[PDB]
Amino acid sequence: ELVNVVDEKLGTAYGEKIDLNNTNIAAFIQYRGLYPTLAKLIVKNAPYESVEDVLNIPGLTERQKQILRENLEHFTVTEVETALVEGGDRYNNGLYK
Amino acid sequence: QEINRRVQASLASGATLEEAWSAIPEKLAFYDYIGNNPAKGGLFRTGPMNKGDGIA
Amino acid sequence: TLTYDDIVGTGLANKCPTLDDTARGAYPIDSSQTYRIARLCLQPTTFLVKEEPKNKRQEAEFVPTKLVTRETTSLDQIQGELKVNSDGSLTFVEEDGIDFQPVTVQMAGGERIPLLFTVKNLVASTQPNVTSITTSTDFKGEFNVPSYRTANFLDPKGRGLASGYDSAIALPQAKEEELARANVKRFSLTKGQISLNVAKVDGRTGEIAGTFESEQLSDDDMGAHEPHEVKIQGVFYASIEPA
């Protein structure tokens, strides 16, 4: 009955891609042009029903939408996991080097 | 090493994986388990090995 | 008005601003304007814990406790929009602030009860037809209570949710079933309820004060044991301003 929800989440797309609804902000450093400007807007405007909903963030520039489109393939969405988003952990998850 | 040797010889004589491993005596397999290694104990961990991991 | 050096070390930093007895006025609400709470402060004075009922299934009461974590308990610098609704009611939507404190209280006999005293994501509303906020106004609302420890927290044996071992490594050949509840950390998220009773209003400044009562669960140690029910009583202060 008892499940570690973080381990479980590693078996979903969360474990394969940047989950726009859960993944810590540092992950956006993996690809050109996402950090810190887009990273901030994405985390601030989460959750999303689908990856393509990220294109609808209010105030995005035309260039930002293009960059987002180029990176949709690296993104996913799964259900919000309380354990990953509480504590401001998406902005600092206690991991440094 | 001896377990793997016996399994390979079984596989080479046309056994299935199930058959090859089923042919390994339990007694040989039990030697290949760290709970039977004498360098895994404690000075004040008293009594039979069975008192730790259990009766196999 | 006091400076940091006036306040430092006195215990005043953990108290909410108060209003004088003359402040029994009314603060006009204009349904055309936007409003905000610039500062909400909540200062607990009493923590009560519901006794775990013997087994009579009779009335289990909330009992007094002793605070052991000192003057570290208040919620403050909380802000958010104050909506005016169709029916003339007000809805405060908490957006940010110092909106949680870990608190440990001690029951008679020694049992320590940690809790995350909080109003995170508070949405609280008045009665309908609040043309002016008076000493008859009150707010009732719900808030979120996340796990007292967050996902990185490691127990004394190094086990955790987002980090740590996933077994009892000191008992290498123990049967794992009876240790599952200790080995598998779970993150709690529940709801709390709060009432704010306005007792004082400065009609000129838009400052209000009064008493609060809140109810929420205590720490469950990442799913290792059952939380306790806690009732928190205290005073509050809020400054309302046109947004």
Next chain:
Amino acid sequence: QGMFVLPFMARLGVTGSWSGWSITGETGIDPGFWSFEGVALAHIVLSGLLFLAACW
């Protein structure tokens, strides 16, 4: 609970603990010094003083 001396303390008015409980089931009582613990401590100190007097 097999309590033997506790009832004798209770019989004469010692009913509370420093830890906040009372044998009548009250909470948040202050028994003052003469809790069950205070009584116990007083007897231990008396024991020590009588021991010293015995030596003299």
Next chain:
Amino acid sequence: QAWKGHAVFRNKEGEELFVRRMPAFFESFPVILTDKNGVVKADIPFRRAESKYSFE
């Protein structure tokens, strides 16, 4: 932990039956139920072959 409540025993005819209580002298005691006038109405038999008062 808790009182289960007061048990009221009744036979098929709906008459209230009363379990005979164990006196302090007895380490073990039979189970005998009587009506309000002390007439035996039910018991737990030892020998079953000539039982007439079984709960069944």
